[PDB]
Amino acid sequence: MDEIDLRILKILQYNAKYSLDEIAREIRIPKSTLSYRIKKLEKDGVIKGYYAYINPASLNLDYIVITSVKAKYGKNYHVELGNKLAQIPGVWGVYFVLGDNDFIVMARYKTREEFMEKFLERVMSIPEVERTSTQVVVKIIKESPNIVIF
Amino acid sequence: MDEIDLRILKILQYNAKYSLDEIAREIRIPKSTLSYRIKKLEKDGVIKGYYAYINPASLNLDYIVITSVKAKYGKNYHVELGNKLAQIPGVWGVYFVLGDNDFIVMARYKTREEFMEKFLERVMSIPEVERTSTQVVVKIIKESPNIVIF
Amino acid sequence: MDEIDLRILKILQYNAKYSLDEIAREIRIPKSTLSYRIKKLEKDGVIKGYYAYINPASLNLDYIVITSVKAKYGKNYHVELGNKLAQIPGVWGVYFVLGDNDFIVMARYKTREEFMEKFLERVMSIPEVERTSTQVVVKIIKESPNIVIF
Amino acid sequence: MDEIDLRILKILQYNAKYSLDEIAREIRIPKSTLSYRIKKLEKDGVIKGYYAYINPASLNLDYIVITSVKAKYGKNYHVELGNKLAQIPGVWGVYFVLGDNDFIVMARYKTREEFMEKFLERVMSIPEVERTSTQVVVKIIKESPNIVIF
Amino acid sequence: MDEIDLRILKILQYNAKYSLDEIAREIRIPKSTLSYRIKKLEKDGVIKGYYAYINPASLNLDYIVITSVKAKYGKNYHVELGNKLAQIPGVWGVYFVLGDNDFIVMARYKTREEFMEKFLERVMSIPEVERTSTQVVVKIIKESPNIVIF
Amino acid sequence: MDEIDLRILKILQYNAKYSLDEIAREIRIPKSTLSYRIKKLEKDGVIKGYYAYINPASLNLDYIVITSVKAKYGKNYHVELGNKLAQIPGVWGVYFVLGDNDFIVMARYKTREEFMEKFLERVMSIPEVERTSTQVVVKIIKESPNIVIF
Amino acid sequence: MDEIDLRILKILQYNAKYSLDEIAREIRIPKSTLSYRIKKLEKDGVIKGYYAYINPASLNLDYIVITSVKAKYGKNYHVELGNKLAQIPGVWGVYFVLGDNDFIVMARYKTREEFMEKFLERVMSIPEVERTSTQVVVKIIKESPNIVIF
Amino acid sequence: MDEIDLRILKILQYNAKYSLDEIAREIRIPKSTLSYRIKKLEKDGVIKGYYAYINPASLNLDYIVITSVKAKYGKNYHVELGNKLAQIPGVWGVYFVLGDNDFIVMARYKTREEFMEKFLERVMSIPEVERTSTQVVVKIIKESPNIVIF
Ligand SMILES: NC(=O)CC[C@H](N)C(=O)O
Ligand SMILES: NC(=O)CC[C@H](N)C(=O)O
Ligand SMILES: NC(=O)CC[C@H](N)C(=O)O
Ligand SMILES: NC(=O)CC[C@H](N)C(=O)O
Ligand SMILES: NC(=O)CC[C@H](N)C(=O)O
Ligand SMILES: NC(=O)CC[C@H](N)C(=O)O
Ligand SMILES: NC(=O)CC[C@H](N)C(=O)O
Ligand SMILES: NC(=O)CC[C@H](N)C(=O)O
Ligand SMILES: [Mg+2]
Ligand SMILES: [Mg+2]
Ligand SMILES: [Mg+2]
Ligand SMILES: [Mg+2]
């Protein structure tokens, strides 16, 4: 992609419902050229899809957690555990990181009870887990994963 | 909102470009009723906006980090630091969490050099920071923040 | 319950032996109305019971401890361990907390010897325990669990 | 005190509303002798008072926390900080312990918001605090501080 | 024992070769009375014995270490491990402490090689050991265990 | 010194009151030769002195502690702090160690109260102290610092 | 560079004194072509120089250490500290790493005394240092930094 | 060796390609005497070999790591693990250190992918590993292992 594609993506990351006319006017290119470039970005896997940004608070997702999970060494415990963590309802992010050399899991639940029932109790029953540490999010200063171009 | 709004949102969180006809058929309600419900969800702040999901790898965002930042106590150091962290280019998530009682910052950069220049060097110069710990993400098992309804 | 029940409880949390006449005068309601409200709070499980507050020092409870206990993951180790900890003589508080994701156990003993015999040696023999950390309380700045209404 | 006083206290720690007749029958001593022994235990400071045990859940005290607080060394920072912590609404327990050589603070709040407003923000503004770590209680396996005689 | 015994012990903790005449003059009691009191302190186990204080440096004991050793929970692992640690040549102190809830082992060796051969390799082969942390002493500011009366 | 001096010291480290006749018989050398060798070891600083080993329990030294103390960097804070720690009544051992790169302080007191008054409160008032961690000794498996030759 | 340069470097990383004839025979290229390629690798900064590998043990470098050093945040403390650490005699490696977000310093000394005098005492006097942790190397399983091509 | 050998080594540690004439002139000794001394240092194992110093950046070795690895206790797990770590492609340094009482492994790779494939995945599959912590090097302030004489 080129500089023009970047200007298009910079707009799309914020508003996926802008009309072709508007964007075409903002970037200074023919609407048909814009339509083509967007179609290609989708075909090339640059634009993976379009999602509605739903306010978690509107769904009463008040119990937000970030949990570190250490896995047992040997066999294929690490890889298998990552997959088990990602299948848990409420879990939207699972990363393996260096430093602590473990998994960081991001999840959202409506209440403590739901978190315990759907997440913690589940993880507590996995034998290949060595340790876990749940950080309760008490303030979201910023959460805009959609912004990839600053 | 009711059960019907939830079925609508469950679809919109995945595909914001579905036509009214398609969704109306999937949920079994008049297209005009659907259009109304969606307009209300937007007006009530439930649907905050629509974004294009861009593949970070397509933008060469290869240096992904999760950093813990501890703040000095006193005055208004904590609140002010959170805001400073959120203003850094590349930073998309800033949370204050219990447990470690500190900030967790999520950011993405193209390279180590960019991370050092735009993020680390910046944070290193803030006097009210007490400690920092950067976890380098080496594998993203899952990252679907758009999914709020499982 | 209403604001009046709260005024009643605020008094009862401090002095359970106050006469109906006194409280009735303090809150400005008929003694019979007070007697009724108290009877209902007991029936509804709001007031669980009335206890005498005994000075631990009078019983020579000089060895006060707060111990963190980590459990092995898998099976039903966590739940079962919590119950084993709560059955130990001298233990009055057992909590499972996030952050360290473990149990915090509050206990009181007359001496180091009693603590070792009744608590530590017991816990040391439980195989599903992974780690423990005992914090010796050397000063109680405040301990008024009875105060629920400030 | 003697063995008889201990039998009396063992009953009073559980039920402060038992009648003299009942206890006298249970322990096998004259009601007047019982009344005398109880009056003396109160006069000698053994029995500090009588409280109603109120169910925290009935007051919607759903956000339960245990926080470790480290103080700056020098001057009289430690002693002064302990007193500041004990004056915070919602705080019922403040202990200084060895091991971590810091304060452990027990508190209860109705919600995260109340905890942040009344406790965390307050503590965050105290300059002599070096570090804090809040453990969110997600399960109370046992909490019977009134039991001093097992 | 009384105040006089304490004055005697205060001298003996520093110089076990002082003559009865000298001590008798220093404390103001008959030499025969002194001889009697000392004989009784030995008989009662107060004075356990008399040792020559040898300068470790004179024996080339240059590799001084303080090692923390954590034991596996269950069976009788803890007690048995303490005894195994105390039987190691070079080990003069073994303590079980709260806080870290583990063993602290004090030892002295002539060289790194001797430490590795006699201590570390030995401990590394004990399966019930969970973790160890050796602190290398690089400066002895004070080491006077013989002083019990200040 | 030679092998003979080592055999002499091996005896003296255990019993400083053995008669010359006894030792001479045990090691197979003339009593006058023994007397000479011992006098030289004392003159050369090998034998620093002779102490009576007093049972700490006989002096009611029931509160035994091992405390780690971290010092502020800069100026001459480290060296000066070590000296301040060594001057505290009850402190018999002060070491600076690598690993934690801090001081390890060994002390003995009769009670918690004495420990707090004489040691902890004192250390709490030293501004150049960064952190402290007191490990309460609950069992002395072995404590024979006098043994330098195994 | 190409595959041929890599074969040349693979030999040079192990033996810088091999003759052109030998290498030319081993890789199958004209000696003059080899001489040219080597001259270019030096000119392009690929080959930085040629060093004699001296056995540290032959120089009595028996005290080997790896120290973590944390710096104060603010101003230009971090960058300046790294440079100060690199100027210390005996220090051959200084790295800033993520995870602990601090400096890792590799050094070698003949004795503990030299380490304390040349390194530790020096670092202890730098005010912008927050913490340090020295790991004493007791066994070098492998140390071949010269091997860049496996 | 003597002072003259040290002057020779001080030059050779920096430039192994200096001619005998040059060094002979710099140190003031006959070229034949120099040739002899160098030959002896090689024969005695002082000079282990001569290597070309290759710039890691020229080989695209951009992912530099320092990993701590803790081993399971018992059998011969420790010794065997050290050897397994040293056999991993990319690993140039393996040390066992006190303090953390574990292994520190230094390695270099071209990319994150290579590090994961060749190092991390390999180590993750070793059952006797208890924990690992990888520190990503983001800046090499100094790396001159060849310098043994300052
Ligand atoms: N430029 C526009 O916005 C629309 C007309 C133009 N010819 C096109 O096809 O794009
Ligand atoms: N039902 C549909 O999808 C469209 C027609 C319907 N009458 C409406 O207005 O929605
Ligand atoms: N008010 C009182 O305290 C007692 C009398 C009142 N009529 C009642 O029954 O409560
Ligand atoms: N024993 C009782 O319970 C009451 C009567 C008895 N004489 C008394 O004064 O206690
Ligand atoms: N007082 C002394 O020192 C010796 C003489 C004294 N009569 C005694 O037996 O002790
Ligand atoms: N050998 C002994 O124990 C004493 C007698 C011997 N001649 C000596 O002077 O030592
Ligand atoms: N090939 C060799 O090793 C030397 C001769 C060849 N012609 C050259 O110049 O390299
Ligand atoms: N001194 C030199 O550099 C060479 C000549 C001298 N005679 C020698 O053999 O070393
Ligand atoms: Mg999106
Ligand atoms: Mg009560
Ligand atoms: Mg002694
Ligand atoms: Mg070299």
**Can you tell me whether residue D4 is helix, strand or coil?**
helix
> Going by C-beta distance under 8 Å and a sequence separation of 6 or more, which residues neighbour residue G57?
none
Alpha helices in E13-142 (DSSP H): 20-27, 31-43, 77-86, 112-114, 121-124
Q: Which residue bears the tokens 């530099």?
A: H64
What's the rounded Cα separation, in Å, for the pair E8 and D123? 53
* Ligand whose nearest atom lies closest to the CA of B28: 2
Q: How far, in Å, are B57, B111, H3 from residue A148 at the CA level? A: 10, 14, 62
Q: How far, in Å, are E13, E26, E41, E150 from residue E47 at the CA level? A: 9, 20, 6, 17
In order, the DSSP letters of chain H are --HHHHHHHHHHTT-TT--HHHHHHHHTS-HHHHHHHHHHHHHTTSEEEEEEEE-GGGGT--EEEEEEEEE--STTHHHHHHHHHHTSTTEEEEEEETTTTEEEEEEEESSHHHIIIIIIHHHHT-TTEEEEEEEEEEEEEEE-TT----
Q: How far, in Å, are B5, B9, B17, E73 from residue B14 at the CA level? A: 15, 9, 9, 49
The experimental technique used to determine this model is: X-ray
Four-point Cα dihedral H43, H48, H50, H55, nearest 10: 180
For residue B67, give the chain G residue with the closest CA. G99
| Domains defined for chain A, CATH in brackets | 1-52 (1.10.10.10), 53-150 (3.30.70.920)
DSSP annotation of A74: S
What's the rounded Cα separation, in Å, for the pair D60 and F69? 43
Structure tokens at D83: 């007193």
What's the rounded Cα separation, in Å, for the pair H107 and H118? 10
Asked if residue H78 has its Cβ within 6 Å of ligand 8, the reply is no
Structure tokens at B133: 């710990």
Q: Which residue bears the tokens 């053994």?
A: D46
Task: Provide, as residue numbers in chain G, all residues whose Cβ is less than 8 Å from the Cβ of B135.
Answer: 98-99
> Going by C-beta distance under 8 Å and a sequence separation of 6 or more, which residues neighbour residue G2?
none
| Residues in the ligand 7 pocket, defined by CB under 6 Å | G 21, 24, 30-32
Structure tokens at A82: 């990552």
Whether H116 contacts chain B with CB within 8 A: yes
Q: Evaluate whether E67 touches E34 at the Cβ level (below 8 Å).
A: no
> Going by C-beta distance under 8 Å and a sequence separation of 6 or more, which residues neighbour residue E95?
E103, E104, E105, F64, F66, F137, F139, F140, F141, F143
Whether C120 contacts chain D with CB within 8 A: no
What's the rounded Cα separation, in Å, for the pair B76 and D125? 7
Among the atoms of ligand 8, which is closest to the Cα of residue H35? 10
Dihedral-angle region of residue E19 (phi above 0 means left; psi in -120 to 50 means alpha; beta otherwise): beta
Asked if residue B31 has its Cβ within 6 Å of ligand 2, the reply is yes
Contact C92 D143 (CB under 8 A): yes
Contact D93 C144 (CB under 8 A): yes
Structure tokens at E86: 């105390």
What's the rounded Cα separation, in Å, for the pair B146 and A64? 15
Supply angle C-alpha F140, F143, F145, rounded to 5: 160
Q: What is the distance, to the nearest Å, from the Cα of residue G27 to the centroid of all Cα atoms in its chain? A: 29
Q: In degrees rounded to 5, what are phi and psi of residue H73?
A: -90, 155
CB atoms near residue A73 (< 10 Å): 22
Q: What is the distance, to the nearest Å, from the Cα of residue B61 to the centroid of all Cα atoms in its chain? A: 16
Q: Evaluate whether A109 touches A67 at the Cβ level (below 8 Å).
A: no
Q: Tell me the pairing of strands H102-109 and H91-97.
A: antiparallel
Q: Evaluate whether B56 touches B119 at the Cβ level (below 8 Å).
A: no
Task: List, in sequence order, every residue forming a beta bridge with G132; answer none if it has no partner.
Answer: G69
Among the atoms of ligand 6, which is closest to the Cα of residue F29? 1
H or E segment and range at residue A81: helix A77-86
Structure tokens at C124: 């040391």
Alpha helices in G13-107 (DSSP H): 20-27, 31-43, 77-86
**Can you tell me whether residue C31 is helix, strand or coil?**
helix
What's the rounded Cα separation, in Å, for the pair B77 and B64? 27
What's the rounded Cα separation, in Å, for the pair C131 and C67? 10
Task: Provide, as residue numbers in chain D, all residues whose Cβ is less than 8 Å from the Cβ of C137.
Answer: 95-97
Which residue's CA lies nearest to atom 6 of ligand 4?
A: D30
Nearest CB partner across the interface for H136, out of A74, A77, A98: A98
Q: In degrees rounded to 5, what are phi and psi of residue G100?
A: -85, -10
Supply angle C-alpha H145, H147, H150, rounded to 5: 140
What's the rounded Cα separation, in Å, for the pair D65 and B120? 33
Contact G12 H94 (CB under 8 A): no
Residue E57 class from Cβ within 10 Å (0-12 exposed, 13-18 middle, 19+ buried)?
Answer: exposed
